[PDB]
Amino acid sequence: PVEVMAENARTGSRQMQALTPAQRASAVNTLADLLVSREKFILDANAKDLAEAQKSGLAKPLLSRLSLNPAKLKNLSVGLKQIAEDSHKNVGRVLRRTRLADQLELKQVTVPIGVLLVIFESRPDSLPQVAALAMASANGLLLKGGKEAAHSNKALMELVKEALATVGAEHAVSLVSTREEISDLLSMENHIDLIIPRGSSDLVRSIQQQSLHIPVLGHAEGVCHVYIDRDADLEKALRIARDAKCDYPAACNAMETLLIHEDLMSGAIFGDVCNMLKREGVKIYAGPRLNQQLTFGPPAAKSLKHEYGALECCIEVVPSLDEAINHIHTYGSSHTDVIVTENDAAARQFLGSVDSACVFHNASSRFADGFRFGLGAEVGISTARIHARGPVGVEGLLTTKWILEGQDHAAADFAEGGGRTWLHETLPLD
Amino acid sequence: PVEVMAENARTGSRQMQALTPAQRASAVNTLADLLVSREKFILDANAKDLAEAQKSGLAKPLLSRLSLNPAKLKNLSVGLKQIAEDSHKNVGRVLRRTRLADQLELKQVTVPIGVLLVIFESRPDSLPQVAALAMASANGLLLKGGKEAAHSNKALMELVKEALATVGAEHAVSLVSTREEISDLLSMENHIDLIIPRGSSDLVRSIQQQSLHIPVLGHAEGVCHVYIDRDADLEKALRIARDAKCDYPAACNAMETLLIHEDLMSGAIFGDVCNMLKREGVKIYAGPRLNQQLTFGPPAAKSLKHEYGALECCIEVVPSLDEAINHIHTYGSSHTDVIVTENDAAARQFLGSVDSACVFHNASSRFADGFRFGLGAEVGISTARIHARGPVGVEGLLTTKWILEGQDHAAADFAEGGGRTWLHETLPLD
């Protein structure tokens, strides 16, 4: 059934909550041991199901991404061992240590969240990553893939459950049957806490439209932005755009626009960047002011807020940096923005003005990866303005909790009748 | 109109964003100056509108709470001066300072949120508190009261706007007309960020039912919980219940239940606590196991999860602390819970097991006030499991933002083609 799974996972969260010191670590490292040692089962199941699914041949992305190879197994094993070694103090870290009065220490500490929900398309590689993260956050977790990889999902479920049953002896992890009318599973509440979609923009937007009365992680668009000032070296901007677009076009934090200072139009940079885009085969449109600017220029852009994903990039030019901030806050998804120049006045002004989830200077839009952030294995990219900004490591998965151990105190005692005063001496948090 | 207000407030947030060092502080202290110096206007308006509203005589709570006195003015003035003095470094505080490679410093800093929305019943005292908080968070803020206090709302709006126009010269603050079909104002999005209801449980629950596709602060019930172990002094528990219930019955974080160890039933404590409840006139019900326990006992409780607010408290007894944790997580709103005993094994076990927003030991349920937390002037009580837990000071009103100022770097440079390595030397955050 379903609800039984929810409450079983709740209790398992309660259980795993009491296994912090190297215990869950032993669990996940043993999981990595089995993931690297008993692989036969796994790839034979995958070969079976993939042979079954190729005849379907739904679409290039899935049909290409769902496969698996021993190289991927080794990669996952080493990443999981890294998570295990570095994730030893996720839960229980202190945040405030204040003594209000004699022998009274209020403190706020981190806490597991509870029954998470992970949603993703065919990605048999994904499940172990997220599961290791959950086990590193000791919190419950639910799982739901799609129509495909079914047998492999089962196999990995069995493997991780076996690795689990060793320590803790209580399983707070599951998987569900065919698509289980996910609108239902979402309508559930008081059990599940945060939604983590992982399939792709289509799927996350499906969630966004469905998502109601339940908090949501993740983003919906990846509309980055790049501006050039009149005070930047040409080839710098050139290689910047080159790397920022022609690295992973389908990626979410890849630049899909370009703005330029008006004055640099007379320095023939424009043609140079278009030459680069052609060398990388980029279908570029034009922007209204630029549209006017040249005799014909590139063709006309449909809408400024479009999302391409392929080798396309809108281009537009504006007189003042202020106009640039206007256009950004107007059209940008506040996902990830940048600026290039060699005067810092523009830099300070821009970076204090723009309000994206993460901004840059002389860098690429292709840095939002969590790992590149030295933030370990990320789980999503929050565009929401709450609890998390952009790349979410493990931190956005453990909330806070106040505790307080009074000796004999009460509330009215601090009134004038009782001799109680207030100290607020925030001791050095351990 | 409305949207013009939204965007004007956005721009004003941009503006006030550039006034951190003692500038907004000067603004709010001058606001306090005028709030304490030009009071004539204010109380005459209030007298007018209150005389008009008494003939209506809607209900005791509002008709009693909406008034105002020079004492309240002095109190607000001093609280605002406190906020001004201690809130000098809200925005711009660093959180991570990591250098990924040579001359490349990624850093994550705090940031204003944007267009807040405050909703509350007749509380002419409230508006200046929240407005000072906003000005202390430099972020936009919207305002909406109710049918009453209209002229006083206007007057205070004018006063705070005059105090504003001095510094910043840009007003990001407003108020709306009669109730403006708040469902509409809520349906707005991409402008407003967080909802802060302030009226009362009825109103916040109205929001909760309405609240969709927009994050929400606040709580919905205040179902606290108190347990007694077989290892606690009697009169300790007695005075605890006394203070925890008979201090502010209508308060939200006031205890509205009671659990007891089974063995203490033979120590006649039960009658003692009932004597206390009678001395304080508390209509008590009974719990199913207790219901069975005595020959007749107190009468039968309708439902365990009821909310009283008045001088009532359910009472129930269970054999094992584990049963207690079960009942808590089953019925408790995870709002605020406690335990009393004199063995610490029970203490550690309980406090690691229970998962409320804030827990206690030998203290009262009447501590959730933010101010008592030495957390300054709180704004609400978050029961949600995201971004904030229980009492929210100013901290839950400033989110994070990554910035990064590279020199000439790029993304592929860190691949094997370019000689780039990773340092992750988290410098001491300033």
mmCIF file of C-alpha atoms in Angstrom, chain A residues 255-386:
data_model
loop_
_atom_site.group_PDB
_atom_site.id
_atom_site.type_symbol
_atom_site.label_atom_id
_atom_site.label_comp_id
_atom_site.label_asym_id
_atom_site.label_seq_id
_atom_site.Cartn_x
_atom_site.Cartn_y
_atom_site.Cartn_z
ATOM 1 C CA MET A 255 23.568 30.936 -20.784
ATOM 2 C CA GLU A 256 20.705 31.556 -23.210
ATOM 3 C CA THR A 257 21.085 35.276 -23.910
ATOM 4 C CA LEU A 258 23.678 38.020 -24.256
ATOM 5 C CA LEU A 259 23.702 41.748 -23.580
ATOM 6 C CA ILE A 260 26.273 44.278 -24.729
ATOM 7 C CA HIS A 261 27.236 47.875 -24.100
ATOM 8 C CA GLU A 262 26.169 50.064 -27.011
ATOM 9 C CA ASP A 263 29.569 51.644 -27.598
ATOM 10 C CA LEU A 264 31.329 48.372 -28.338
ATOM 11 C CA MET A 265 29.161 48.077 -31.453
ATOM 12 C CA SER A 266 31.731 50.258 -33.235
ATOM 13 C CA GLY A 267 34.607 47.944 -32.299
ATOM 14 C CA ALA A 268 33.388 45.146 -34.574
ATOM 15 C CA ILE A 269 33.227 42.758 -31.625
ATOM 16 C CA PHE A 270 29.686 41.855 -32.682
ATOM 17 C CA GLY A 271 30.819 40.169 -35.873
ATOM 18 C CA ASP A 272 33.574 38.408 -33.976
ATOM 19 C CA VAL A 273 31.164 36.806 -31.526
ATOM 20 C CA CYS A 274 28.844 35.833 -34.352
ATOM 21 C CA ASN A 275 31.825 34.237 -36.072
ATOM 22 C CA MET A 276 32.376 32.256 -32.903
ATOM 23 C CA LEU A 277 28.721 31.218 -32.748
ATOM 24 C CA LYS A 278 28.896 30.038 -36.341
ATOM 25 C CA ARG A 279 32.124 28.156 -35.620
ATOM 26 C CA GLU A 280 30.070 26.487 -32.901
ATOM 27 C CA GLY A 281 26.897 26.562 -35.005
ATOM 28 C CA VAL A 282 24.603 28.691 -32.853
ATOM 29 C CA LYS A 283 21.272 29.869 -34.257
ATOM 30 C CA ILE A 284 21.161 33.423 -32.975
ATOM 31 C CA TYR A 285 18.263 35.847 -33.056
ATOM 32 C CA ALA A 286 18.324 39.615 -32.602
ATOM 33 C CA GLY A 287 16.961 42.043 -30.056
ATOM 34 C CA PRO A 288 14.658 44.980 -30.723
ATOM 35 C CA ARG A 289 17.236 47.725 -30.272
ATOM 36 C CA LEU A 290 19.771 45.658 -32.186
ATOM 37 C CA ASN A 291 16.991 44.717 -34.600
ATOM 38 C CA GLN A 292 16.765 48.401 -35.413
ATOM 39 C CA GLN A 293 20.517 48.836 -35.212
ATOM 40 C CA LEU A 294 21.832 47.023 -38.266
ATOM 41 C CA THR A 295 20.693 47.066 -41.907
ATOM 42 C CA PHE A 296 19.419 43.521 -41.612
ATOM 43 C CA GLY A 297 21.351 41.750 -38.846
ATOM 44 C CA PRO A 298 20.252 38.347 -37.622
ATOM 45 C CA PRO A 299 16.533 37.520 -37.780
ATOM 46 C CA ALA A 300 13.852 38.573 -35.337
ATOM 47 C CA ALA A 301 13.419 37.019 -31.905
ATOM 48 C CA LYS A 302 9.954 35.774 -31.004
ATOM 49 C CA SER A 303 9.947 36.541 -27.270
ATOM 50 C CA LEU A 304 12.689 37.632 -24.899
ATOM 51 C CA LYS A 305 11.812 35.027 -22.255
ATOM 52 C CA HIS A 306 12.070 31.972 -24.477
ATOM 53 C CA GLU A 307 14.019 28.878 -23.463
ATOM 54 C CA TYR A 308 16.053 27.087 -26.120
ATOM 55 C CA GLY A 309 18.342 24.441 -24.636
ATOM 56 C CA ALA A 310 19.928 23.924 -28.047
ATOM 57 C CA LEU A 311 22.610 25.963 -29.840
ATOM 58 C CA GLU A 312 20.726 29.247 -29.735
ATOM 59 C CA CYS A 313 21.323 32.532 -27.963
ATOM 60 C CA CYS A 314 19.443 35.786 -28.177
ATOM 61 C CA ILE A 315 21.574 38.901 -28.439
ATOM 62 C CA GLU A 316 20.672 42.481 -27.598
ATOM 63 C CA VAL A 317 22.369 45.803 -26.850
ATOM 64 C CA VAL A 318 21.450 48.622 -24.468
ATOM 65 C CA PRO A 319 22.976 52.025 -23.688
ATOM 66 C CA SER A 320 23.147 52.085 -19.891
ATOM 67 C CA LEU A 321 23.950 49.472 -17.291
ATOM 68 C CA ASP A 322 20.796 50.630 -15.568
ATOM 69 C CA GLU A 323 18.819 49.605 -18.623
ATOM 70 C CA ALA A 324 20.634 46.302 -18.281
ATOM 71 C CA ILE A 325 19.510 45.811 -14.690
ATOM 72 C CA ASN A 326 15.999 46.685 -15.801
ATOM 73 C CA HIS A 327 16.050 44.077 -18.537
ATOM 74 C CA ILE A 328 17.539 41.466 -16.230
ATOM 75 C CA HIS A 329 15.066 41.853 -13.378
ATOM 76 C CA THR A 330 12.368 42.081 -16.037
ATOM 77 C CA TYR A 331 13.214 38.974 -18.039
ATOM 78 C CA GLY A 332 15.830 37.057 -16.077
ATOM 79 C CA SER A 333 14.599 34.124 -14.047
ATOM 80 C CA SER A 334 16.974 35.265 -11.291
ATOM 81 C CA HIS A 335 18.509 31.852 -11.930
ATOM 82 C CA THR A 336 22.136 32.841 -12.548
ATOM 83 C CA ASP A 337 23.634 36.033 -13.971
ATOM 84 C CA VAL A 338 27.074 37.463 -14.673
ATOM 85 C CA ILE A 339 28.950 40.574 -15.801
ATOM 86 C CA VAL A 340 32.231 41.235 -17.579
ATOM 87 C CA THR A 341 34.319 44.423 -17.474
ATOM 88 C CA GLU A 342 37.633 45.670 -16.112
ATOM 89 C CA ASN A 343 36.365 48.559 -13.973
ATOM 90 C CA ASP A 344 35.236 47.603 -10.501
ATOM 91 C CA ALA A 345 32.787 50.481 -10.062
ATOM 92 C CA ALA A 346 30.583 48.763 -12.603
ATOM 93 C CA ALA A 347 31.264 45.536 -10.729
ATOM 94 C CA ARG A 348 30.190 46.744 -7.297
ATOM 95 C CA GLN A 349 27.197 48.533 -8.789
ATOM 96 C CA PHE A 350 26.003 45.528 -10.771
ATOM 97 C CA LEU A 351 26.561 42.973 -8.032
ATOM 98 C CA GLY A 352 24.778 45.090 -5.458
ATOM 99 C CA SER A 353 21.958 45.757 -7.884
ATOM 100 C CA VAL A 354 21.298 42.403 -9.503
ATOM 101 C CA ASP A 355 19.426 39.957 -7.272
ATOM 102 C CA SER A 356 19.936 36.542 -8.875
ATOM 103 C CA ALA A 357 20.324 33.322 -6.929
ATOM 104 C CA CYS A 358 24.014 33.447 -7.825
ATOM 105 C CA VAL A 359 26.047 36.022 -9.739
ATOM 106 C CA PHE A 360 29.511 36.090 -11.234
ATOM 107 C CA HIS A 361 32.274 38.256 -12.638
ATOM 108 C CA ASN A 362 34.565 37.095 -15.473
ATOM 109 C CA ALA A 363 33.329 33.542 -14.835
ATOM 110 C CA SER A 364 31.010 31.292 -16.838
ATOM 111 C CA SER A 365 27.348 30.487 -16.434
ATOM 112 C CA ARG A 366 28.473 26.848 -16.280
ATOM 113 C CA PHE A 367 29.468 26.867 -12.620
ATOM 114 C CA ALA A 368 26.167 26.001 -10.937
ATOM 115 C CA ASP A 369 26.919 22.361 -10.084
ATOM 116 C CA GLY A 370 27.214 22.149 -6.303
ATOM 117 C CA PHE A 371 30.253 19.932 -6.677
ATOM 118 C CA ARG A 372 32.062 22.773 -8.432
ATOM 119 C CA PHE A 373 30.830 24.850 -5.504
ATOM 120 C CA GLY A 374 32.798 22.545 -3.218
ATOM 121 C CA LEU A 375 29.371 21.790 -1.750
ATOM 122 C CA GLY A 376 29.535 18.056 -2.308
ATOM 123 C CA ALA A 377 26.882 16.249 -4.331
ATOM 124 C CA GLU A 378 24.031 18.681 -4.835
ATOM 125 C CA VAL A 379 20.416 17.576 -5.111
ATOM 126 C CA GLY A 380 18.734 20.375 -7.038
ATOM 127 C CA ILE A 381 18.804 24.040 -7.929
ATOM 128 C CA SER A 382 16.395 26.055 -5.825
ATOM 129 C CA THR A 383 15.065 29.108 -7.589
ATOM 130 C CA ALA A 384 12.587 29.766 -4.788
ATOM 131 C CA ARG A 385 13.376 32.617 -2.423
ATOM 132 C CA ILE A 386 13.088 30.506 0.737
#
